[PDB]
From a paper:
O-acetyl serine sulfhydrylase (OASS), referred to as cysteine synthase (CS), synthesizes cysteine from O-acetyl serine (OAS) and sulfur in bacteria and plants. The inherent challenge for CS is to overcome 4 to 6 log-folds stronger affinity for its natural inhibitor, serine acetyltransferase (SAT), as compared with its affinity for substrate, OAS. Our recent study showed that CS employs a novel competitive-allosteric mechanism to selectively recruit its substrate in the presence of natural inhibitor. Results show that CS uses a noncatalytic residue, M120, located 20 Å away from the reaction center, to discriminate in favor of substrate.
Similarly, M92 interacts with main-chain carboxylic group of T69 with the distance of 3.5 Å and M96 interacts with main-chain carboxylic group of S70 at a distance of 3.7 Å. In the case of HiCS, mutation of either M92 or M120 completely abrogates the formation of reaction intermediate (as both 330 nm and 470 nm peaks are not observed), but mutation of M96 has subdued effect. On-rate binding constants of mutants of HiM120A, HiM92A, and HiM120 AM92A are ∼286-fold, 80-fold, and 200-fold lower than that of HiCS wild-type. HiM92A exhibits approximately fivefold increase but in the M120A background, M92A mutation fails to reverse the effect of M120A. However, OAS binding-induced fluorescence quenching of M92A mutants shows species dependency with StM92A showing 62% quenching as compared with 1 to 5% quenching of HiM92A and MtM92A mutants. Mutation of M92 also affected the substrate recruitment although to a lower extent.
Residue numbers in the entry:
A (entry chain A), B (entry chain A): 2 to 94, 96 to 311
Amino acid sequence: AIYADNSYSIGNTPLVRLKHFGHNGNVVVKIEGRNPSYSVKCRIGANMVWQAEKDGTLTKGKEIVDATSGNTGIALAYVAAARGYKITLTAPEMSLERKRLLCGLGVNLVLTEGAKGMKGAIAKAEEIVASDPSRYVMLKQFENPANPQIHRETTGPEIWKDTDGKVDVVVAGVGTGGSITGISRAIKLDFGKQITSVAVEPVESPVISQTLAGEEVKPGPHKIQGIGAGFIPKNLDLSIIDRVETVDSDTALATARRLMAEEGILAGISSGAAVAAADRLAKLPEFADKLIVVILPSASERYLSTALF
Amino acid sequence: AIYADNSYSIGNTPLVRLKHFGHNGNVVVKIEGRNPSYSVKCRIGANMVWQAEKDGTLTKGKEIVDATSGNTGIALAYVAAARGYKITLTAPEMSLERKRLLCGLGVNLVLTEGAKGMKGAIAKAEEIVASDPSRYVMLKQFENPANPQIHRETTGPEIWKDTDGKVDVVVAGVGTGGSITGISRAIKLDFGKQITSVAVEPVESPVISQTLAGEEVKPGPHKIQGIGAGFIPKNLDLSIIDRVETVDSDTALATARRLMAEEGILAGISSGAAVAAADRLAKLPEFADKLIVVILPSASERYLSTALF
Ligand code: NA
Ligand code: NA
Ligand code: NA
Ligand code: NA
Ligand code: NA
Ligand code: NA
Ligand code: NA
Ligand code: NA
Ligand code: NA
Ligand code: NA
């Protein structure tokens, strides 16, 4: 049928079997690049706005304020326009692409200082909302339960259905933790199957690995955009994570290049990280006959001025 | 279920109702940006390769050769990689984006001369195939019947199904003519409904309008990428075209900007042309109670270095 606005069209993304990764086709990928704003975030942009409306936090008149490095800003920005909200986004004043894309979607952009970076813009966002709390709503991707909820309701059931319940393993890079949390809850709790949930983080910032091992948390710089926030976010449910896999920046990129040239899949850099990690678990006899489903958060063109090209 | 390669995942694209165009929601758009390679072309890349295989023109060993300004090169290029063909693409040596994207997908790129432009590269493609006819296959988007056939089989039936047969008008910019031809054949001949088929061309190169009016064909330069090839291609079936609408380059762009900021739809420049044209037919009493479905060939990020931003 016909979606009332772009927000209602989120998801129903396809499963594609890999040919040059895994073992006799045991690695299938979910292309989240096929969304209204072309990322997994389209799901949480739609559901964080919907839920804020259902509980009167977001009202006709009120104005979205938020800080974004990328995908969620673009997602929350297509939703704002579709549903008729003014939005203000703050960002480490960067990617000229993402700046031009955001102004294109009718976002009132506020640039912070580089040296301060991501936490620079968060502060600035908060100030704008403390200037007039009654007119501003910060949705807060890293802790908003509406983030994991849409993945329990949509991304997870789609995996169940499309695999006919044969899914044995889910692999998901962790940014907010929303996807692995929501997906894992759907299959383990709603559908009653005891899959292996695998979180993927950069080896350069292995904070989930470090936490779970009782070792000093040392975050670090990497090139895998969308994962490796350098802290454990509230929307990563550790309790549902059966395994953590680390990937280096170089491998992730090469794997993203391999996905394009060898499989004809236009995947983002974080997509190369999940697939590198899935490929390793797939070439262990213990996962040989298991069906491994991998989340490919974004598409290639979002990355044209990055190390991916 | 699970697609054997990226080629099998083409289409099943969503219908989104517009809010700031048409009259009481009579204009709904089909987002073809949601495809393996993020355009309508993904459909013809898949089906031109499939059909060449089904009739032994394309064989394991053989090598795709073709000339492309954009979308079909990227489409045929993701298919080549997914199905395991080497491909050579020639192009007016341009858009650095599209160059980097194509090399990214494992395409052996051949650049021609600018001044000669699009017909420059066609010639060069032909030479490469005359150098060794037995190892090269040119698929020829502008006349290959497999182009309109996939739209009769997929894009058209999806419109029928999603609208429940209530579709009254289809609006489609014409590049190859494949989409309007295939879609129109599905609904008029396969489903038996006498819709208005509307072809959209730039007012700067109104060659379809000029032809049908028995007036001298004067092609001209414009900024609407993907339509207005400046000749009538063999895959445009004039016989199924009930009406032709012309749009200027400036309007098309503003409409593409309106689609982003007002509707939260990331559409390409040609998407602004179809919607401008649909909006005019929608605000005539004669189309007031009619359901108008519009083809939005591509997505915004394909256009970041263009006049759209
Ligand atoms: Na596999
Ligand atoms: Na990832
Ligand atoms: Na996750
Ligand atoms: Na990605
Ligand atoms: Na990424
Ligand atoms: Na409308
Ligand atoms: Na068009
Ligand atoms: Na067409
Ligand atoms: Na377009
Ligand atoms: Na276009």
